[PDB]
Amino acid sequence: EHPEFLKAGKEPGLQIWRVEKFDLVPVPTNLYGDFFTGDAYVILKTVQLRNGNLQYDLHYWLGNECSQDESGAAAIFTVQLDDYLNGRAVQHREVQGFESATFLGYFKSGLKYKKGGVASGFKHVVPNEVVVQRLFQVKGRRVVRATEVPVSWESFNNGDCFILDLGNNIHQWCGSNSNRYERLKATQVSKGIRDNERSGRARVHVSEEGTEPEAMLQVLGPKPALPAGTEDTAKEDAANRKLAKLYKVSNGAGTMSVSLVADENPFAQGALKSEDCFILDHGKDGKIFVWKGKQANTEERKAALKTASDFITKMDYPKQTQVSVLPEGGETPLFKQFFKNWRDPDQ
């Protein structure tokens, strides 16, 4: 608590730790002096003072090739160690090839630098980056639903709408024979992806036959003659009505039950209740959603997650099926589309 802090430093001597993936790991004892240039270390020296208590010196050493997390951690570990020694230790920053004379005098043979070291702890991100290229068919008679299809002109027809999502840019495209309800849904979902999925950091471009932009053609290739299409039948509508099922994971009644709430679309928003988790299985399209209620307990959450991902293999869904997990209030458009009249809480 922490085990390495407990060991340090209780008597005269020299201790050396290497920073490894956010941790303080003691250096093999006959390796003291060997220093990896890709790495960062912390060194405590303890001297016996003739008055009974001890003098501490903390030196954190930084190789010319060490990653920022390691040098940052090395530094912070130094202060946490000094604090644990009631601020009674003197901190020295030691840069490779510029080490303090006092530091050098801790090693009777002199340091030996070593190429390489342990991989950085950082996962790497570029802020606000999104890499997305996907295509949607927005289709229905009166019950329009968005469903994913290959990124090619072959998916297109002059009778439905399509959302070509490229990250910062969303192409909403409707064919001339697309009915009134498909148009609203195209717009609803496009704005959803932009404002909600991309936090407003995206631009929607509306298009149709003969207006489609450079960047759309850049992906899809040169526009061929598009088919059709057949009008939407009330029978196709009732199919969209059965596209997804809605389960409730709860143990509120003493035991873990996964109940089927609804198999008919659109679901009632009211059905998603905060004390529990829910799964919206749209697995055929490769999408299962795990809705965590803010008051659902931790076991309910792990179960929902487990159940959701069992479905992929139980129902032989086409992996790479994506299980997205949604916090209450953090719901996404491709999941909000299955509800009757979504009401945005704070409005």
């Binding site: 956010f22 040098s71 604090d83 901190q91 950082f122 570029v126 606000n128 959450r301």
Partner: protein, 365 residues
């Protein structure tokens, strides 16, 4: 599972938000809440807000408020929804499942930190949280425990001498001059030239011009003379609706304000003077290390040349033999956040969380 910590760095102009153990914040968005504009007499009790980048995108039909002023939270209602938007939209996570690290302005009043903590536990239900001083994290990021930081953002600039891990509070220096001001001044300066930069829309184009073509002159009055000799130093810039505008000495006159706050009518000492003054408020025995570890932080320190200026200016102010170093890390827009990501990932930090239970047993603390 196993649980990841959230690091969220709330600043006057921008929220830098993400998961501990990353290089960088995953989400970086304007620190603004916008409601739909209304004109005149008042009738009702209202409705919806928009937060962050969606507010930028929708500004043409809304009025934008800033929850953080000069690095301090002053609007709790709107700060609540800046956090809501971070948790549920930008990171898209359940806050109840992640320990959360938050940053604060240096000298942040006790009552601010206590409200912040209250809101996290009582409205957001986080399992644990910790508050870190912005500047201190930045120092850690560069792998130092001793040094003096210049943090300068959109709304505030600070000088924070730090020794052996902790800031020396009486030597801390706060100057209410940062990005927004510089941006406002560039708007002014360009308008005097003969362009039209007044509207808040135009304030966004100028921010871009500011951050793309401005630099700090190594020597101001020399550069003025270069600018009056040739077009050599001039840059061109294209407006969306436009059309091209020419920019000249305003390129360097704008950031100059940091060293000469009278450019905008401020009685204050310049950032070089406030640095020196800060070092001088410290124990004589530690000044030597303060001078050799000037670490730079915040988007407003990004100006090309600023490091060489700090160097020239500080050299001038200090004892003749004093070793002076200016450290300007390439990724300094995010030093504060990186500092947090590293601290929150450490094996030993687990001990430092204020847990929910511990909260429900004392007056924040």
């Amino acid at each position: 599972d196993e649980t990841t910590a959230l690091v969220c760095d709330n600043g006057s102009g921008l929220v830098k938000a993400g998961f501990a153990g990353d290089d960088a914040p995953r989400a970086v968005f304007p620190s603004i809440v916008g409601r739909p504009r209304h004109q005149g007499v008042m009738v009702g009790m209202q409705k919806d807000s928009y937060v962050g980048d969606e507010a930028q995108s929708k500004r043409g039909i809304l009025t934008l408020k800033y929850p953080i002023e000069h690095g301090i939270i002053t609007n709790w209602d709107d700060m609540e929804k800046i956090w809501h938007h971070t948790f549920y939209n930008e990171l898209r996570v359940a806050p109840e499942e992640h320990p959360t690290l938050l940053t604060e302005a240096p000298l942040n009043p006790k009552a601010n930190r206590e409200k912040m903590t209250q809101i996290m536990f009582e409205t957001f239900n986080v399992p644990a949280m910790y508050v870190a001083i912005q500047a201190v994290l930045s120092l850690y990021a560069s792998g130092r425990t001793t040094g003096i930081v210049l943090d300068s953002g959109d709304g505030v600039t600070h000088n924070v001498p730090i020794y052996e891990g902790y800031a020396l509070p009486h030597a801390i220096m706060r100057l209410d001059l940062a990005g927004r001001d510089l941006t406002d001044y560039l708007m002014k300066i360009l308008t005097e030239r003969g362009y039209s930069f007044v509207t808040t829309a135009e304030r966004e184009i100028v921010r871009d011009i500011k951050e793309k073509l401005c630099y700090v002159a190594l020597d101001f009055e020399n550069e003025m003379a270069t600018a009056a000799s040739s077009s050599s130093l001039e840059k061109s810039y294209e407006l969306p609706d436009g059309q091209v505008i020419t920019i000249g000495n305003e390129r360097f006159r704008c950031p100059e304000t940091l060293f000469q706050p009278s450019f905008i009518g401020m009685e204050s000492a310049g950032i070089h003077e406030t640095t020196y003054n800060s070092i001088m408020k410290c124990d004589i025995d530690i000044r030597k290390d303060l001078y050799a570890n000037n670490v730079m932080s915040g988007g407003t320190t990004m100006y090309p040349g600023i490091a060489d200026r700090m160097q020239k200016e500080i050299t001038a102010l200090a004892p003749s033999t004093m070793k002076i170093k200016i450290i300007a890390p390439p990724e300094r827009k995010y030093s504060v956040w990186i500092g947090g990501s590293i601290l929150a990932s450490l094996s030993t930090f687990q001990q430092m969380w204020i847990t929910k239970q511990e909260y429900d047993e004392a007056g924040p603390s």
